[PDB]
């Protein structure tokens, strides 16, 4: 495969324990 | 396969315990 | 096949327990 | 609001492109 | 809010470009 | 807010570009 | 596989115990 | 705020360009 | 495998016990 | 705010490049 | 006589020639 | 007669000739 | 689509925090 | 799209905190 | 007639030609 | 896409913190 | 008629021919 | 995309603190 | 008549010819 | 894309603390 990324700005990522994240 | 990027900018992943989260 | 990706902005994925979320 | 949360053991989020994903 | 969580294993959290992924 | 948490194992935060990830 | 990398500005992963996190 | 926490074995964490990653 | 960087500002991971954190 | 961790055994934060990693 | 501004987000403000502008 | 800013993100002012603009 | 404009003496543009201004 | 313009003379943009601004 | 400044992140003045301009 | 521009005489730009300014 | 600035990242001023500019 | 521009006399631009400015 | 400066990043102002400019 | 430029007089160019400037 292949993978070509364009512009991102505020990607978030969270796994396990993430309770009240992620409040743009 | 192949995947190109556009442009992204609040891209939220949350795996786990995730309540009270994405509050835009 | 082949993804080409638009324009996001507020996209957002919860797997778990998510509950009281995505209050836009 | 009380996340309790029993055993998990396969649980993913994917947010944004996800193409070809979740492939059991 | 209280976060307690049980037993966890396999938890993954893809944000962005996540093509191909979670493949169990 | 209390973070009690669980016995966690095998736990994955990818965040940007994770093509052909979480292939358990 | 192969993977190119665009424009990234504020891309976060978090892994365990991400509880009251990203706040944008 | 409080951040207990439990026993964890394999966090993971990858930001920016992860691809090939979080192989079980 | 072949991985080439674009440009990056803000890229942050945090593993472990990472609560009240990513506060942009 | 208070950290006060458990047994932490394989935790691992990669920021940047950092593909083919975290191969368990 | 005072004021207290709350959270702004995209704020446009155009005088004179501003023809086929603000396409959100 | 005081003001007081709480938080801008993406604030335009254009005054003059300004078509084609403010393409949000 | 082309603008040519006209005569402009006293043209005001203000985004943002405004209170109490334009006055005549 | 081009554009031409004519006269300007007191032409004022303002961006931000502008409180008590643009008195003619 | 004091005024203070939160935090600003992309703000943006044009006075004059500015078409075309703006392009969030 | 061109700009030609004709007589400009007082034109003013301020970005931030510009209380009490423009004053004709 | 003091004035205190917070915190500013992207703050532009153009003034004159600022056509094709600003593009965020 | 060229820009040829006229008669410019008084052009002034300002970033950051500017309270005051801008009196003609 | 005094003024305290915060915390600036990327400040920029441009005065005359600035046409294809302030491309963040 | 190239920039010719004509006349100009008084070009006033600021950046940071400009607090009570560009008085004409």
Same mark, same amino acid.
């Given at each position: ?5 364009? @512009?991102?700005? @505020? ?11 992620? @409040?743009?």
């Amino acid at each position: 495969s292949s993978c070509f990324g364009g @512009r991102m700005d @505020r990607i978030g990522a969270q796994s396990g324990l993430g309770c009240n994240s992620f @409040r743009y």
